[PDB]
Amino acid sequence: HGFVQNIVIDGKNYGGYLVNQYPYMSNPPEVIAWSTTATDLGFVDGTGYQTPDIICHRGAKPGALTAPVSPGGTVELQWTPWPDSHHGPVINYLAPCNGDCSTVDKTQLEFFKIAESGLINDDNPPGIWASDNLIAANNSWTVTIPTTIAPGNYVLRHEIIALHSAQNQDGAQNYPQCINLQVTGGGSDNPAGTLGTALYHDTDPGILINIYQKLSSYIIPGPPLYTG
Ligand SMILES: [Cl-]
Ligand SMILES: [Cl-]
Ligand SMILES: [Cl-]
Ligand SMILES: [Cl-]
Ligand SMILES: [Cl-]
Ligand SMILES: [Cl-]
Ligand SMILES: [Cl-]
Ligand SMILES: [Cl-]
Ligand SMILES: [Cl-]
Ligand SMILES: [Cu+2]
């Protein structure tokens, strides 16, 4: 359980959607982060993978604001403290807004995978995962925006999938968090995208999995990584 509280881009902080605060206030601020209704700080499990909740989390709506990113710049997402038990991959996607991200129809977003990290070491099951790297980095993840994609406005869909209960069907816990970015530079690719509701299925080999056994490999969920 947790959420993204802060985003660091080009030497400033952009506050996140504080789902434990803003849903209870009259006058929540405009932010680059999507609003959600996930006030339990929880997840979308496999029962939700073919529902709109998986796109940017339960009840999500676009952020009002969009953050510029320098060409090939970084976006650092800072989480609330991530539980050690919640082992799993960290995955990042972009989808073009083709206009202002604040007015996009989330159900039409076509995401391409720009980064993925999975099982890092398995000397001591259940092992060390990308989520454990995130914890070790004081609950942070750094995304590098590709220089090879067409400039424009994009949604970044940043996600942890916790696998501590994933031995049974619909037991994996997905924690998507979306933010709005303006990508800048000289790239030209328009990578092939996947609708949010087509990213995952509840029988995928990196979804329906017993992490407590020895693992010789791990198939990170979702469509293929884009590399320009
Ligand atoms: Cl709100
Ligand atoms: Cl505001
Ligand atoms: Cl305000
Ligand atoms: Cl925690
Ligand atoms: Cl655009
Ligand atoms: Cl270990
Ligand atoms: Cl471990
Ligand atoms: Cl362009
Ligand atoms: Cl496998
Ligand atoms: Cu949890």
Author numbering: 1 to 228
Paper's wording?
Three out of the six high resolution AA9A structures, two from Lentinus similis (two different data sets for the same enzyme) and one from Thermoascus aurantiacus, were determined in this study. The data for all the three structures extends to very high resolutions. His147 in LsAA9A and His164 in TaAA9A were investigated for the protonation states at Nδ1 and Nε2 atoms of the imidazole ring of the histidines. Our results suggest that the His of the secondary co-ordination sphere is singly protonated at the Nε2 atom in most if not all structures. Examination of the micro-environment of this His residue in all the LPMO structures of this study show also that the distance of the Nδ1 atom from main chain N-H is between 2.75 to 2.95 Å. Therefore, this N is likely to serve as a H-bond acceptor and reinforcing the view that the His is unlikely to be doubly protonated.
Lytic Polysaccharide Monooxygenases (LPMOs) are a recently discovered group of copper metalloenzymes that depolymerize recalcitrant polysaccharides like lignocellulose and chitin by oxidative cleavage of the glycosidic bonds. The His-brace is made up of the Cu metal center coordinated with the imidazole ring Nδ1 and backbone N atoms of the terminal His and the imidazole ring nitrogen Nε2 atom of a His located later in the protein sequence. In this study, the focus is on AA9 LPMOs, where a conserved His and Gln (His147 and Gln162 in LsAA9A) form the 2nd coordination sphere and a strong H-bonding network has been shown in the crystal structures.
